[PDB]
Amino acid sequence: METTEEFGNRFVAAIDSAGLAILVSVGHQTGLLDTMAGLPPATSMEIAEAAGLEERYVREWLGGMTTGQIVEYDAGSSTYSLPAHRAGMLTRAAGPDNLAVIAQFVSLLGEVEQKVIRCFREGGGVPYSEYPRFHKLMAEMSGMVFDAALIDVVLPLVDGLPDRLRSGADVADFGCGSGRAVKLMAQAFGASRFTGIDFSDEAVAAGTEEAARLGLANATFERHDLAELDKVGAYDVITVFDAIHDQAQPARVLQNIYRALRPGGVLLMVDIKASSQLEDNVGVPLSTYLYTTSLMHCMTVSLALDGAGLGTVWGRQLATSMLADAGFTDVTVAEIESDVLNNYYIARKLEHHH
Amino acid sequence: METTEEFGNRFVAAIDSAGLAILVSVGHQTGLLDTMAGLPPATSMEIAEAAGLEERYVREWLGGMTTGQIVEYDAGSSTYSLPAHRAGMLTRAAGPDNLAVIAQFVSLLGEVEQKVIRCFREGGGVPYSEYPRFHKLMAEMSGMVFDAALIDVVLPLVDGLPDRLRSGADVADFGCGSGRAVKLMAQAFGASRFTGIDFSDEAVAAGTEEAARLGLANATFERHDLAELDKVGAYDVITVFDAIHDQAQPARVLQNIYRALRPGGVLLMVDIKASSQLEDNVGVPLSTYLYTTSLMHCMTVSLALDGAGLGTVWGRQLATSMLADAGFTDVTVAEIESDVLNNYYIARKLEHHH
């Protein structure tokens, strides 16, 4: 049984961990972590010089990184070092496995804390437009994951999908952002036609420009809100990467996906790995982070639009039953051993004609 | 030796702890924690009703508080409860020992993260005026500590001080804010004359109004910047609660304090308990929090004024030597067993006439 003293100590340690997360975020954005990964043991002044930064700031940062047991300090020589085993997951050299990137979300949620608190009292939500930095970061992170794994790891989860794409299919990516996924797929699969759909006029224009740059005649982009579409029996394959649980009208989006698929078609929906039952998420790493991210961003943005507010932790069971509600009678859930955060939902449409 | 895997797990746990700190902050500001401390096990809807808050927000908050192992959830009945041993240090009923208050500093530092990051590149600092919420909270927290401990615990650390005040002394409080400390002392010690000095015209006016309210003829307030004072042999006793390490010109402030004291006088300076040597702070609870608070507030506000930027962790050794530089040849450091964050520096002035 946990005592008052033990709880006090655990919570003070959480406070220290929170400070440390912010320091790591600062370390990422300033290039300090990258800089120390390329240095031998060095003074505060040496580190600041190598980083091109103000030493007084670097010095205070170093102090907290040291008390947080990430940076190691040698008092005899007044030198600091970032152990290689830690550097390996806190630097840009790790790309999508750089955990310092996730640390940035602590400041990002903090920036909206007062706005979210108001919603506890007054209802509604904080609009999508309040989170430009948050969204920019998610887009960068997803770009790296698509580059690393989309073609060779993710698409092969769907039995027969790489051959179908090679042979030739009509494909859409719903919620395509700048069109990274469409770009990669259109390159890998010249026989297939790809349409990226996104709500942002800017993102769509950027997709179109980039497809023109690279001579990708088989990639087009279109601005639409995913809840209001006129696509009917248009696509053999539809991808949806992380977009559904944020929607104002997720059920209508899923219904639109089903309508847009041709008979024999397949939806690949990638969304957050968690249970729809709270008790199952207790003890699983990142569960608190996921509830917090939901409360302070993914849930509230949907509620701003008087939406469903399913949140980040909507969960496998609810996702599976909503796919059934949308008309899919054939749903499987795939996992990648090297991916703790995502489920890969594979939903196939009956071959039967209307 | 810590492995890559072990570091990965520890840092993911820090991320979860950071989320949990933000949730606790939200719990404090919304009254949710207070509400649950007065309830039996209850549903999300019951809790939201009791709190007067939007259930959908309460529900998501509950999820993260549960995965963070603060709130307990019973899946059989869908009820939540806040154990008494945890409630005891997360609710307003604990006053200055409410740890939920310290959790608010995570959002507060997050709100300034981008501004601080700019200073790593461009120098200078983030001005004091950027932190009104932060300062309001510190003032509330200090108010409660003064109410609880100033008269009966803190002032008795100085041998002979309560009797000297009872008998009659000229006293000043440097950095008095709204004048809480002066108010309490002026009430306890009718024979003594108290002057609160603060940089804020508003704080000073509020002090004066309140002294008029309560018929405290022996309490006055004056607006001055602590670095530029004309007080010479004016006071037998000077108090400085938490104000020195934030100053642009701390050495000049301490010199002004020494000049302002009469021969035989005493300074009571209360400031942060930590070492001036980084290696000593490693492993001490709250050290990371203190470096982070320094980097993102106390140090940077001083640097904004092209100041000393000593920071929150300036430390005992440096504080002691700066008191010597200011002219004090007689300095002791007192601790209160029930106070991990503050040192009590007692600096006495020679009895010898100019």
Q: Do A289 and A334 have their domain in common?
A: yes
Inter-residue contact A295 to B61 (CB < 8 Å): yes
Q: Do A256 and A343 have their domain in common?
A: yes
Of B107, B117, B277, the CB nearest to A113: B107
Residues A40 and A47: their CA atoms lie apart, in Å, by: 10
| Residue A153, CB-side half-sphere exposure with 13 Å CA sphere | 13
Q: What are the Cα distances from residue A217, in Å, to A200, A203, A206, A213, B69?
A: 21, 18, 15, 10, 53
Contact B120 A26 (CB under 8 A): yes
Q: What DSSP state is assigned to residue A273?
A: -
Q: Is B292 on the interface with A (CB under 8 A)?
A: yes
Q: Do A223 and A96 have their domain in common?
A: yes
Is B230 annotated to bind ligand?
A: no
Inter-residue contact B231 to B253 (CB < 8 Å): no
Of the three residues A91, A125, A147, the one that is the final residue of a domain is A91
Strands A193-198 and A261-272: what pairing? unpaired
**Full residue range of the structural domain in which residue B31 is found:** 1-91
Helix (H) or strand (E) holding B343: strand B342-348
By the 10 Å C-beta count (0-12 exposed, 13-18 middle, 19+ buried), A352 is classed as exposed
Q: Is B350 on the interface with A (CB under 8 A)?
A: no
Q: Do A21 and A127 have their domain in common?
A: no
Q: Is A44 on the interface with B (CB under 8 A)?
A: no
Residues A119 and A112: their CA atoms lie apart, in Å, by: 11
Task: Tell me which chain A residue has its CA closest to the CA of residue B292.
Answer: A19
Q: Which two tokens stand for residue B228?
A: 């530029």
Q: Do B112 and B73 have their domain in common?
A: no
Per-residue buried b or exposed e for A232-266, using 16+ beta carbons within 10 Å of the residue's own CB = eebbbbbbbbbbbbbbbbbebbbbbbbbbbbeebb
Q: How many domains does chain A have?
A: 2
Residues contacting A132, CB < 8 A, separation 6+: none
Q: Do A76 and A99 have their domain in common?
A: no
Contact B67 A13 (CB under 8 A): no
Q: Is A30 on the interface with B (CB under 8 A)?
A: yes
Distance from CA of A128 to the nearest CA of B (A): 17
> Dihedral sign, CA of B221, B223, B226, B231?
negative
Inter-residue contact B313 to B274 (CB < 8 Å): yes
Q: What are the Cα distances from residue A179, in Å, to A172, A176, A207, B155?
A: 11, 5, 5, 67
Residues A308 and B205: their CA atoms lie apart, in Å, by: 50
Torsion of CA B81, B83, B86, B88, to 10 degrees: 100
Distance from CA of A60 to the nearest CA of B (A): 6
Inter-residue contact A231 to A259 (CB < 8 Å): yes
Residues contacting B240, CB < 8 A, separation 6+: B173, B174, B175, B257, B267, B268, B269, B270, B271
Q: Do A146 and A181 have their domain in common?
A: yes
Inter-residue contact B20 to A290 (CB < 8 Å): no
What is the amino acid identity at position B68? G
Q: Which two tokens stand for residue B150?
A: 């100033």
Stated length of chain A = 354
Q: What are the Cα distances from residue A86, in Å, to A37, A81, B66, B99, B220?
A: 9, 10, 29, 30, 56
Distance from CA of B128 to the nearest CA of A (A): 17
Contact A7 B58 (CB under 8 A): no
Is A236 annotated to bind ligand?
A: no
Residues B222 and A198: their CA atoms lie apart, in Å, by: 61
Identify all chain A residues contacting B7, using CB atoms and an 8 Å cutoff: 85-86, 89
Q: What DSSP state is assigned to residue B53?
A: S
Q: Do A178 and A31 have their domain in common?
A: no
**3-class DSSP assignment, residue A250:** helix
Q: Is A303 on the interface with B (CB under 8 A)?
A: yes
Residues contacting A135, CB < 8 A, separation 6+: A128
Identify all chain B residues contacting A67, using CB atoms and an 8 Å cutoff: 278, 281-284, 287-288, 291
Q: Which residues pair with A254 in a beta bridge?
A: none
Q: Which residues pair with A309 in a beta bridge?
A: none
Distance from CA of A4 to the nearest CA of B (A): 5
Residues B288 and A61: their CA atoms lie apart, in Å, by: 10
By the 10 Å C-beta count (0-12 exposed, 13-18 middle, 19+ buried), B222 is classed as middle
Per-residue buried b or exposed e for A148-162, using 16+ beta carbons within 10 Å of the residue's own CB = eebbeebbebbeebb
Q: Is B60 on the interface with A (CB under 8 A)?
A: yes
Q: Is A20 on the interface with B (CB under 8 A)?
A: yes
Contact B291 A14 (CB under 8 A): no
Q: Do A189 and A51 have their domain in common?
A: no
Give the closest residue to B271 by CA, choosing from B152, B151, B178, B142.
B142
Most A CBs within 10 Å, among B9, B16, B80, B306, to test the A interface: B16
Strands A342-348 and A261-272: what pairing? antiparallel
Give the closest residue to A336 by CA, choosing from A145, A177, A175.
A145
Q: Do A231 and A184 have their domain in common?
A: yes
Q: What are the Cα distances from residue A247, in Å, to A199, A303, B11?
A: 11, 9, 30
Of the three residues B43, B66, B91, the one that is the final residue of a domain is B91
Contact B57 A89 (CB under 8 A): no
Q: Name residues 162-221 of chain B within 8 A of A (Cβ).
A: none
Inter-residue contact B193 to B218 (CB < 8 Å): yes
Q: What is the resolution of this structure in A?
A: 1.8
Of the three residues B91, B126, B141, the one that is the final residue of a domain is B91
Of B2, B15, B73, the CB nearest to A289: B15
Q: Name residues 305-324 of chain B within 8 A of A (Cβ).
A: 309, 311, 313
What Rg value do the Cα atoms of chain A yield, rounded?
Answer: 23
**3-class DSSP assignment, residue A192:** coil
What is the amino acid identity at position A329? T
Of B60, B287, B309, the CB nearest to A295: B60
Q: Do B98 and B78 have their domain in common?
A: no
Inter-residue contact A52 to A30 (CB < 8 Å): no
Question: Residue holding tokens 């304090």?
Answer: B257
By the 10 Å C-beta count (0-12 exposed, 13-18 middle, 19+ buried), B250 is classed as buried
Q: Is B120 on the interface with A (CB under 8 A)?
A: yes
Of B88, B281, B311, the CB nearest to A67: B281
Q: Is A340 on the interface with B (CB under 8 A)?
A: no
Is A247 annotated to bind ligand?
A: yes
Q: Is B132 on the interface with A (CB under 8 A)?
A: no
Q: Is A17 on the interface with B (CB under 8 A)?
A: yes
Inter-residue contact B125 to B300 (CB < 8 Å): yes
Distance from CA of B18 to the nearest CA of A (A): 4
DSSP B146-209: IIIIIIIIIGGGSTTHHHHHHH--EEEEET-TTSHHHHHHHHH-TTSEEEEEES-HHHHHHHHH
Give the closest residue to B218 by CA, choosing from B257, B178, B190.
B190
Q: Do A104 and A173 have their domain in common?
A: yes
Most B CBs within 10 Å, among A16, A54, A109, A131, to test the B interface: A16
Q: Which segments of B282-340 does DSSP mark as H helices, in order?
A: 287-293, 299-304, 316-325
Residues B226 and B245: their CA atoms lie apart, in Å, by: 12
Is B16 annotated to bind ligand?
A: no
